[PDB]
């Protein structure tokens, strides 16, 4: 309840067929007030993530 | 001419069974179970509701005239299989009671012997 910034490193482990469920769901379980950071390896399809996030927590997200 | 007997005949059977449906779904699937206590009394009520519906969905699917009837036919022997089981279970309940009463009559005759 005193957290407004989250630093997500290693974001691309959402494609882990083993554990990537955890990274995905936990972001879905975020309150929408919070600001976020996302750091991962270069993917070509980065915008899809932002295109996914920006609706489901209803705030802008830069790439 | 040719359709003229059968269509009125079958609709009359719908007309025959149409009040039977409403008395069947008079009280709900919860209610008609929750008024009952014995699970054996709960048992066939589950089946018989499905038992008609199986035929019902096999009936109305003919009216589209679709050449397939398998994925309800595939459900058909299922409902039989569960109706197959508990009857054979309820057969065994007899042999539980059928022979235990002979145990009752035998041991009384032993002191009589």
């Amino acid at each position: 309840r005193e957290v407004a910034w989250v630093i997500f490193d290693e974001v691309h482990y959402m494609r882990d067929k083993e554990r990537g469920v955890v990274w995905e769901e936990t972001i879905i379980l975020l309150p929408d007030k919070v600001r976020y950071v996302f750091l991962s390896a270069t993917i070509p399809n980065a915008m899809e993530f932002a295109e996914w996030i920006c609706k489901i927590h209803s705030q802008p997200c830069h790439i | 001419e040719k359709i003229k007997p059968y269509v009125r005949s079958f609709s009359k059977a719908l007309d025959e069974l149409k009040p039977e449906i409403e008395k069947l779904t008079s009280k709900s699937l919860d209610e008609q179970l929750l008024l009952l206590s014995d699970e054996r009394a709960k048992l066939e009520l589950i089946n018989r509701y499905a038992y008609v519906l199986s035929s019902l969905m096999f009936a109305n699917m003919k009216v589209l005239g679709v050449k397939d009837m398998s994925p309800i036919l595939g459900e058909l022997k299922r409902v039989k299989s569960y109706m197959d089981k508990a009857k054979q279970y309820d057969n065994r309940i007899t042999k539980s009671n059928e022979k235990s009463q002979a145990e009752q009559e035998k041991a009384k005759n032993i002191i009589s012997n």
Binding site: - | K2, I3, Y6, V7, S9, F10, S11, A13, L14, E16, L17, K18, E20, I21, E22, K23, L24, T25, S28, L29, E39, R40, K42, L43, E44, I46, N47, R48, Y49, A50, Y51, V52, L53, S55, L56, M57, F58, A59, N60, K62, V63, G65, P71, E75, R78, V79, Y82, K85, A86, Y89, R92, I93
Partner: protein
């Protein structure tokens, strides 16, 4: 009661078996009103099948038959503990 109303179901089962046994498309050719009466007799079926939709309330249909047979299974397993433990 099972033996009464299912005998009436069997009565309509055979009548349902009696339905599309004839060639039905020929008078659908000879009028829409044959077909429309056949549509109207299906409107009974659009109501009479809906009675058990109402009891709940194809791919719709594929769902609930599980959930019908869901409740069949938990009987016998309870009956297993009601009888085999007994």
């Amino acid at each position: 009661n099972p033996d009464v109303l299912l005998s009436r179901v069997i009565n309509v089962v055979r009548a349902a078996s009696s339905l599309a046994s004839q060639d039905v498309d020929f008078y659908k050719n000879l009028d829409r009103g044959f077909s429309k009466d056949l549509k109207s007799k299906a409107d009974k079926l659009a109501d009479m099948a809906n009675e058990i939709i109402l009891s709940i309330d194809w791919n719709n249909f594929g769902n609930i038959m599980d959930n019908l047979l869901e409740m069949s299974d938990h009987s016998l397993d309870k009956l297993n503990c009601a009888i085999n433990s007994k």
